[PDB]
């Protein structure tokens, strides 16, 4: 058997459906599966009050406030606040039951259903690790993970060390390998292989040892980008094979420990750290409990040979001939194959749902593309026209929204426009027509429009499977300007700002320059533009390299007259801020020189107080910050528990008068002890 220890099976095991079913139902030790179940349940229990939003349920789902919401299906609606609290309570009970191993399958369903309901209620909170938590719960619902270290065995002789089928480990290993490979297959973009995605990450103090032998640019390009891509592409292969398992384990442990401190991503790094020993032998916890000293080997459960179980199948040369697979042995193999195929296909299915394709493909959350694209937003304008009188008005951007992801997607923009159209008649506005003007730059590009500003979105056509026509294409043949843009930006002072704009032919930009923005100019970089002064009604054509000075406190318009897109930039300085800073410096220097020999004073003293606080925090040890962190966490947990108790009591018995409820609310918001 040449290949019988590098892969775990032989080529003859895949020569028939029956042989494949026999191979995939091979009995296995369940200890590692049990440890993983315990750890995932604990992590989900800890995660529910923090990231799932139990501590802000009253703020999010108030009784009678006007909110625009973005569900995947518009038919999906939230429940009243008390029923929302009940849903969260059921989810928490399910997570606790999953962790303990008590009533395993009912607990699995009780966690799985409200979690996915909450996920599908709101598209603006989707990310990759929440999607992964849902997928893992779905997998664990169909697994025999309560056969070792549960409470079910310590009450029912059947689930005390029994065997499990082989595909339970196969599905989990395939899932972890998929995410790793998929993540390393989406990092083959030129915006990442060229060092644009995370250019400021290497400035952290955690990259100091690399700077000893490398420069800043070289440590940003060599280590953060290419090193990360290599780790992503090689982690699964390194972990699969046992000759490289220790090296791979050390690398992934360092990677996830670094990521836990670099970002704020909840419990994703710890789930990834805990999912790595699933690649080792299924019996490693037994060896670990055997290696410990004998003085602690008499209180833990005894180590014995695992008992036979009905879930798996037994093929022996002398122990009878064979058992014909039933309806349970073939279903596991079919589920494994189909689930792995679907997990492989879904991150590459964007050619079918074209109505969700903006500058970036698909909705964010299920494609394993983390930290590849970074967005900057310069300006948002919303304008309406009254349908009965005809006046024009302007709205504050994001009035009835609780998030900001509506500026990048056309489906969310359509939902927001419909919500605004339905809610505006409450403010003496007849059937309106709404227009949007949003300026975005992606990965340090030219700022441009994403949507057509001349199209009314209330009547615009949107379909899930049709490409949207009112989305402005990304100007790809302008990216090589980035080096010149960085040169220009670095060639400025400490009180001068610059904005780079790319405009489409046939459109125009209306801009009101603030009164305090003295010394504002515009320089043409490509194409041709015309600048119109509104007060003086005077036009002026510009050619490449031309610079023009603009007045403050007035209106001006820029017209794009080239047959191709044109690029220009704004240079401006806050004259009021400059004068205030210089006179503050004058006054402070004079006072200090006299000593050694009024909003500005307030700002300076508060800045000095901030610096003193920062210095004191730097000088103090980390134990005080640890105590503060623990106090904050305990406050969050206590408030969540008290709110849940109040809501449950209201639901079960009945709401009291408007005094006891206020007293309870005031009591719950009390800090435990300072």
């Amino acid at each position: 058997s040449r290949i019988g220890k590098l892969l775990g099976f032989e080529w003859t095991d895949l020569s028939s459906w029956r042989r494949l079913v026999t191979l995939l139902n091979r009995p296995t030790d369940p200890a590692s599966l049990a440890v993983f179940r315990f750890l995932f349940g604990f992590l989900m229990v800890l995660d529910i009050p923090q990231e799932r939003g139990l501590s802000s349920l009253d703020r999010k789902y108030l009784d009678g406030l006007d909110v625009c919401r973005f569900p995947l299906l518009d038919a999906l609606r939230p429940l009243p606040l008390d029923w929302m609290y009940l849903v969260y309570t059921i989810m928490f009970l399910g997570a606790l039951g999953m962790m303990l191993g008590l009533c395993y399958r009912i607990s699995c369903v009780l966690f799985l259903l409200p979690y996915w309901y909450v996920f599908l209620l709101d598209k603006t909170s989707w990310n990759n690790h929440s999607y992964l938590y849902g997928l893992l719960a779905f997998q664990l619902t169909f697994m025999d993970a309560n056969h070792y270290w549960s409470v079910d065995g310590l009450l029912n002789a059947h689930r005390r060390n029994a065997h499990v089928p082989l595909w339970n480990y196969a599905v989990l290993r395939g899932q972890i390998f998929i995410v790793y490979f998929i993540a390393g297959v989406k990092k083959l973009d030129a915006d990442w292989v060229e060092g644009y995605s995370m250019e400021y990450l290497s400035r952290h103090w955690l990259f100091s040892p690399f700077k000893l032998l490398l420069s800043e640019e070289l440590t940003s390009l060599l280590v953060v980008h290419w090193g990360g891509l290599l780790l992503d592409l090689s982690a699964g292969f390194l972990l699969f094979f046992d000759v490289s398992r220790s090296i791979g384990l050390f690398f992934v442990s360092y990677f996830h420990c670094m990521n836990s401190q670099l970002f704020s991503i909840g419990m994703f790094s710890y789930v990834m750290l805990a999912s790595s020993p699933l690649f080792c032998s299924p019996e490693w916890p037994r060896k670990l409990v055997s290696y410990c000293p004998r003085r602690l080997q008499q209180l833990l459960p005894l180590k014995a040979a695992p008992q036979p179980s009905v879930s798996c199948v037994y093929k022996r040369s002398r122990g009878k001939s064979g058992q014909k697979p039933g309806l349970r042995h073939q279903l596991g193999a079919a589920f494994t194959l189909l689930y792995l195929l679907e997990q492989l296909f879904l991150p590459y299915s964007h050619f079918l749902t074209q109505g969700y394709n903006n500058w970036t493909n698909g909705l964010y959350g299920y494609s394993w593309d983390m930290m590849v694209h970074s967005r900057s937003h310069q300006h948002v304008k919303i304008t309406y026209r009254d349908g009965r009188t005809g006046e024009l008005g302007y709205l504050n951007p994001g009035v009835f929204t609780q998030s900001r992801r509506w500026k990048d997607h056309a489906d969310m923009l359509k939902q927001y426009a419909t919500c605004l159209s339905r809610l505006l008649p409450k403010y003496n506005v007849t059937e309106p027509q709404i227009y949007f003007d949003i300026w975005v730059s992606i990965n340090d590009r030219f700022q441009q429009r994403i949507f057509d500003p001349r199209v009314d979105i209330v009547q615009a056509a949107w379909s899930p499977f049709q490409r949207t026509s009112w989305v402005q294409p990304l100007l790809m043949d302008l990216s090589p300007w980035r080096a010149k843009l960085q040169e220009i930006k670095s060639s400025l002072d400490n009180h001068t700002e610059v904005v780079f704009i790319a405009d489409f032919p046939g459109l125009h930009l209306e801009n009101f320059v603030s009164e305090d923005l003295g010394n504002t100019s515009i320089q043409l970089l490509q194409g041709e533009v015309t600048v119109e002064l509104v007060a003086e009604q005077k036009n002026q054509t510009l050619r490449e390299g031309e610079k023009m000075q603009l007045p403050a406190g007035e209106y001006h318009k820029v017209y794009t007259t080239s047959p191709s897109p044109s690029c220009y930039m704004y240079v401006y300085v806050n004259t009021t801020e400059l004068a205030l800073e210089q006179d503050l410096a004058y006054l402070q220097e004079l006072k200090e020189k006299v000593e050694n020999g009024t909003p500005l004073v307030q700002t300076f003293l508060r800045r000095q107080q901030r610096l003193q606080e920062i210095e004191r925090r730097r000088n103090t040890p980390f134990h005080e910050r640890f105590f503060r962190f623990l106090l904050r966490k305990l406050y969050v947990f206590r408030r969540s528990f008290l709110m849940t108790c109040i809501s449950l009591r209201n639901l079960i018995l009945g709401r009291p008068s408007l005094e006891q409820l206020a007293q309870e609310v005031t009591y719950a918001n009390l800090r435990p002890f300072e």
Partner: peptide, 28 residues
């Protein structure tokens, strides 16, 4: 404030906000 005036709705060269980093993967 639900509504804006013409002058304040066209102030393009203003500080946007820059709410920390706040990338799509982070929770914060």
């Amino acid at each position: 404030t639900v509504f804006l005036d013409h002058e304040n709705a066209n102030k393009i060269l203003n500080r946007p906000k820059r709410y920390n980093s706040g990338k799509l993967e982070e929770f914060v």
